[PDB]
Amino acid sequence: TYDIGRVLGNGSFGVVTEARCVDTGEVVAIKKVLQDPRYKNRELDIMKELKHPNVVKLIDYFYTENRFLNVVMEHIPETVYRVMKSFLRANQQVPFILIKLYTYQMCRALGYLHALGICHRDIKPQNLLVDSRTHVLKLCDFGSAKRLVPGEQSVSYICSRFYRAPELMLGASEYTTAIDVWSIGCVLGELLLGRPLFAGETSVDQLVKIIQILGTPSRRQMSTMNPNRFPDVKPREWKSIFASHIASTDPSWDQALDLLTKFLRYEPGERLLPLEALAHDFFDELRLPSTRLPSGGPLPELFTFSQLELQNMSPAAQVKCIP
Ligand SMILES: O=C1NC(=O)C(c2cnc3ccccn23)=C1c1cn2c3c(cc(F)cc13)CN(C(=O)N1CCCCC1)CC2
Ligand SMILES: [Mg+2]
Ligand SMILES: [Mg+2]
Ligand SMILES: [Mg+2]
Q1: Ligand 3 centre and the CA of 44: distance in Å?
Q2: Distances from the Cα of 141 to the Cαs of 13, 46, 126, 157, in angstroms?
Q3: Can you give the CATH number for the domain in which 62 is found?
Q4: Nearest 5 degrees, angle CA 318-CA 181-CA 315?
Q5: Residues 6+ away with beta carbon under 8 Å from 189
Q6: Do 167 and 28 share a domain, yes or no?
Q7: Could you list the residue range(s) of the whole structural domain that residue 27 is in?
Q8: Which ligand 1 atom is at minimum distance from the Cα of 16?
Q9: For ATP, which residues are the binding ones (predicted)?
Q10: Looking at the 3D structure of the chain, how many domains does it have?
Q11: Ligand 2 mean position, distance from CA 40 (Å)
């Protein structure tokens, strides 16, 4: 059924190879992982549930040989990571339309996941597939994802370090899908800046870099992150962090930095929820009928909200997001 070739090379468990479905001629990605004798594979189980324009499609799966599970998923040629490095090498800002398009599609995917009670727990530019020609974006790498409900205890040391919520580094074991929302803010920040917003050398240093920009959380704020004292540090205004990028650039910066602030709240419950975030005016340009990609092509799918998405959006956000 498959012609398997070329390992694509993930930085997590399993091997992912490019392959061709000989039934369809379509290039696919196949993730091979060790399958447990007794337990279901949680990644596959989650993949079987997800049907969303901004989540990699589950195409097939089969068992090989313990044994191996092979998860056949749709193939997308690039990642937000790779797009960003281009612009970094060209010493160029990512165009605001692309930042808007990627942030919107990442919020939709994660909104859907959270509607199913699923926490992705590894949101990062490497895990966000993109096809440059259409600027579609799809979430992938569900190897760390978990069906999470509040009151559940889980591993603390869980995201990739730059995108890791502050409650996780403060040893919270009962966290929420809000940790994915902090990662969204970090990706937005990285799109605006060109380089990771908070780039710690260790997980503790990650927290310190966060505190150095946002400032010291109050003791009240500390208990929203872990109910179980930091030095006082002058925080930095966002207009200070992004000053070089602002100089070299609509009220897009006011809108982006408002959105940035609401994703990156210390208090996990105060972070702006992904589907509500879609109604932010930062995305108004995506809802204009005349808007096209910088190359002139049409926008990708943006307004095809599923029943489950709409049932998790305030009525105010529903009327705003459907044009
Ligand atoms: O097409 C796909 N369908 C999937 O499900 C899927 C997939 C499954 N697991 C992961 C983990 C991370 C990223 C993507 N995936 C891919 C998939 C698509 N590329 C992949 C690359 C490596 C890889 F290992 C898997 C894939 C290379 N690449 C990329 O930009 N990189 C590689 C990782 C660090 C730098 C960013 C361009 C396309
Ligand atoms: Mg099981
Ligand atoms: Mg099969
Ligand atoms: Mg939501």
Answers
A1: 12
A2: 10, 11, 9, 17
A3: 3.30.200.20
A4: 15
A5: 196, 197, 198, 260, 264
A6: no
A7: 2-74
A8: 24
A9: 32
A10: 2
A11: 4
